């Protein structure tokens, strides 16, 4: 603790006084991941491996929930033409937790795949498929040109160029109504001031790379809107109570201890927050059981030392932490120098019952100094000498002897 004084002050010499050094570091031991037992696999291979898909005007929207999946065969193993992600780390997809996923199966030619990103402008990016700025998920694409193409062109899928206004996202357009530009009625067919909005794809093997068909499935992830379902095969271990360890609870992390819960909670409550808006309480995902979270690593390290030309003896002051439960220095934690103050436990100093004038302050009436084979002692600061004078009506004190005192006062300018 003499060497910890020089590291904070960044100086070679240490003067006489109390200095603040550092704070307590409690290293976590184990890791707790609680996950419920689900024997059902997610059917993500139904929408990925199917031959026939839908188009961009009306897609096939499937909901996948209450199962487990494997993203190592989708991401790590990759026989795919394009994988892209935006708001989620693509490496950590097997780690993180979400509620549900909405897969949209559609085929877009290779000239028009550059408009799939949040906040674009295009033919598909306005009147067909929009990505908002708060959209969260990934984009998976694959090259279908060696299978789904045709020499005379593939008319089985069609796409919408024209719409009257901007289409809201996550909405399918099934309307067969002819777009009317002017005041002439179209009567269901094309004509003067009438355009036919739904045209057919350009797909041929004889063209370039812009007309090549791509099967594109965009996944939609939802974070912290609900308790998670799909997740991944991370780990499942038993709880560790009354020990400071790392927490991972349904994707939400933390560091602290597990204690009992005396408060009445909602049965649908995943977790709850304290006055500091961080998680003080959590529900177990496997069975419905509630343990509180109280965080660790609180309190500072304060040192009490004289100058380096006097001695090497350093007293250590703990701040606000009770020392009955207990920096890498374990030597002064052995005991018998321990005195209890209001500010905390003071170790490395022998408490005496006398009352003197001190030098280095601590607090709460307890003050320390360097006195006499010499060691740092701590005591209560004296107020000066006590005088008991009798007072009556018939007594007066008039001084018969005078002196001249000269003092010195320094005011900076």
């Amino acid at each position, epitope marked *: 603790p003499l060497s910890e004084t020089k590291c904070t002050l960044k100086s070679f010499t240490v003067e006489k006084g109390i200095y603040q050094t550092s704070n307590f570091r409690v290293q976590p*031991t*184990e890791s707790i991941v609680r996950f419920p037992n689900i024997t059902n696999l997610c059917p993500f291979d139904e929408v990925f491996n199917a031959t026939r898909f839908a188009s961009v005007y009306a897609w096939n929207r499937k909901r996948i929930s209450n199962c487990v999946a494997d993203y190592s065969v989708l991401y790590n193993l990759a026989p795919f033409f394009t994988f892209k992600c935006y708001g989620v780390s693509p490496t950590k997809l097997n780690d993180l937790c979400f509620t549900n996923v909405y897969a949209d199966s559609f085929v877009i030619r290779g000239d028009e795949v550059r408009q799939i990103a949040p906040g674009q402008t295009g033919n598909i990016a306005d009147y067909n498929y929009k990505l908002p700025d708060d959209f969260t998920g990934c984009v998976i694409a694959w090259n279908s040109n060696k299978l789904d193409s045709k020499v005379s062109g593939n008319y089985n899928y069609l796409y919408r160029l024209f719409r009257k206004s901007n289409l809201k996202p996550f909405e399918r357009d099934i309307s067969t109504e002819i777009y009317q530009a002017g005041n002439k009625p179209c009567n269901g067919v094309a004509g003067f001031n009438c355009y036919f909005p739904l045209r057919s794809y350009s797909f041929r093997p004889t063209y370039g790379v812009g007309h090549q068909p791509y099967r594109v499935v965009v996944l939609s992830f939802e974070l912290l809107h609900a308790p998670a379902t799909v997740c991944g095969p991370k780990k499942s*271990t*038993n*709880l*560790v*109570k*009354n*020990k400071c360890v790392n927490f991972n609870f349904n994707g939400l992390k933390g560091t602290g201890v597990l204690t*009992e*819960s*005396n408060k009445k909670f909602l049965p649908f409550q995943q977790f709850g927050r304290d006055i500091a808006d961080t998680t003080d309480a959590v529900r*177990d995902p*496997q*069975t419905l*059981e*509630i*343990l509180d979270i109280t965080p660790c690593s609180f309190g500072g390290v304060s040192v009490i030392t004289p100058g380096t030309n006097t001695s090497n003896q350093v007293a250590v002051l703990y701040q606000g932490v009770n020392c009955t439960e207990v920096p890498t220095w374990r030597v002064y934690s052995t005991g018998s120098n321990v005195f209890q103050t209001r500010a905390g436990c003071l170790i490395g100093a022998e408490y005496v019952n006398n009352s003197y004038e001190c030098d280095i302050p601590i607090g709460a009436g307890i003050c320390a100094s360097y006195q006499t084979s010499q060691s740092i002692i701590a005591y209560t600061m004296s107020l000066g000498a006590e005088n008991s004078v009798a007072y009556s009506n018939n007594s007066i004190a008039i001084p018969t002897n005078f002196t001249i005192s000269v003092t010195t006062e320094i005011l900076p300018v």
Partner: antibody
Amino acid sequence: QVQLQQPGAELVRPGASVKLSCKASGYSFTRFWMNWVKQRPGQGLEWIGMIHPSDSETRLNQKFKDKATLTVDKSSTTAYMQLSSPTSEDSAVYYCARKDYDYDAWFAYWGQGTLVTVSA
Amino acid sequence: DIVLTQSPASLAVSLGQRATISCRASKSVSASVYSYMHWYQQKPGQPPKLLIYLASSLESGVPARFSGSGSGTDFTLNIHPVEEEDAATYYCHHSRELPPAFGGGTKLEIKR
């Protein structure tokens, strides 16, 4: 099948130190905590102490302070209990138990038992 | 902590009746919906076994004649039908307060 193993009987004089062995198998040693249960006949069960084996941190009874010393061995997956200066009232039946933690802490598994007779 | 006291010390129940043995607590063990009590049965020369966890439930491997109920500081141990292999010491335990305590014990006999 997780089964805790203890020797049958130990003999020690008063004033000396005695050491006991609790062997864990079938499960990882640092993932649980170890509890020690004292049984004196006619009094009932008494609680000695509880130790996290990975951190080597002990939780002891207030009456049982400085009588018992709890150490572990992570290499052999075997927990130890060391007593300091036993008396004539300290002759009892000692157990070790694995505490599985989910919500409330039960006692899942037990040992074979050890009877320590303190006499000269 | 919480000191447990069971009454009476010995109980003689004939075959075909229902036994009731109470474990009383000094303070309330009820928290987080599920309070904290366990029931342990120990034969002489044998280690004890886990029987009832969280007072509404039954451990697998334990037969269905061993059951418990009660709320607050007054808990009941309901054993019925009584059989001749059921004679052993009964113990109760709370994990609520640190450091935890153990019960005094109650011996059950069969009156014939």
